[PDB]
Structure 1
Amino acid sequence: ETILEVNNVPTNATSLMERLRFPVSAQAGKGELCAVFRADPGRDGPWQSTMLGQLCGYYTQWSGSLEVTFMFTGSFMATGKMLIAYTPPGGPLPKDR
């Protein structure tokens, strides 16, 4: 299990460690959107920061399942819930939950 750079927004050298963790905050409870990322490892994006996305670059055709493993680094007294949806192909970017 290697770190996925979902938050690949920051570009300058002083903020390249902000790229490994994405935030969750207090919202108004409308079912907002936190983050979305494509599930293509050999593609150019978050998976290029993995040992799967660097070794699948040395190969052309892949098969089998994946697994993303999210970890919460907030307080102990904090609680909450998240929906982590895999939208198969054809589905555009979902507009709501």
Structure 2
Amino acid sequence: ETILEVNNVPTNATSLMERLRFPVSAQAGKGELCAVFRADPGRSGPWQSTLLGQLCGYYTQWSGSLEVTFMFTGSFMATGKMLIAYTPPGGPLPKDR
């Protein structure tokens, strides 16, 4: 397992460390979409940060099952529910939660 830079938005030099994690907070209301990315271990995107990704670049084609893990680093007193959902090839990102 290697850190997937799902939050691969800040490009600034002294912020690159933020690309390692995305946030969740009070401002967000139920239903709100938090984040979203593709299952593309090869291609450019958030996967390029992972060792997996970087190795694929040294290869032309591939196939297999993947395994993303999500670690909540918030307070201990923090609670709530997040809904992670995978949509196989085709079916665009679900309209709403």
- TM-score, length-scaled by structure 2: 0.93
Distance, in Å, in 1 between the alignment partners of 2:28 and 2:11 is: 30
Q: How far off is 1:78 after superposition?
A: 0.6
The residue aligned with 1:94 is: 94
Q: How far off is 1:28 after superposition?
A: 6.0
Q: How far off is 1:23 after superposition?
A: 0.3
Q: 1:28 to 1:11 in 2, by over 3 A?
A: closer
Q: What residue ranges of structure 1 are gaps of 5+ in the alignment?
A: none
Q: 1:10 to 1:28 in 2, by over 3 A?
A: closer
Q: How far off is 1:70 after superposition?
A: 0.4
Q: 1:28 to 1:3 in 2, by over 3 A?
A: closer
Q: 1:69 to 1:77 in 2, by over 3 A?
A: same
Residue identity (%):
98
2:23 match: secondary structure:
strand
Q: How many residues align?
A: 97
Q: How far off is 1:27 after superposition?
A: 4.5
Q: CA offsets, 1:16-68, max 9 Å, x none? A: 11111100012464411000001111110010001100111111121110000
Larger mean Cα displacement after TM superposition, 38-47 or 19-28 = 19-28
Distance, in Å, in 1 between the alignment partners of 2:52 and 2:20 is: 16
Q: How far off is 1:8 after superposition?
A: 0.9
Q: How far off is 1:93 after superposition?
A: 2.3
Structure with more helix by fraction: 2
- TM-score, length-scaled by structure 1: 0.93
Q: Which runs of 4+ in 1 moved over 3 A?
A: 27-30
Distance, in Å, in 2 between the alignment partners of 1:65 and 1:79 is: 30
Q: What residue ranges of structure 2 are gaps of 5+ in the alignment?
A: none
Larger mean Cα displacement after TM superposition, 55-64 or 65-74 = 55-64
Q: 1:67 to 1:28 in 2, by over 3 A?
A: closer
Q: 1:28 to 1:15 in 2, by over 3 A?
A: closer
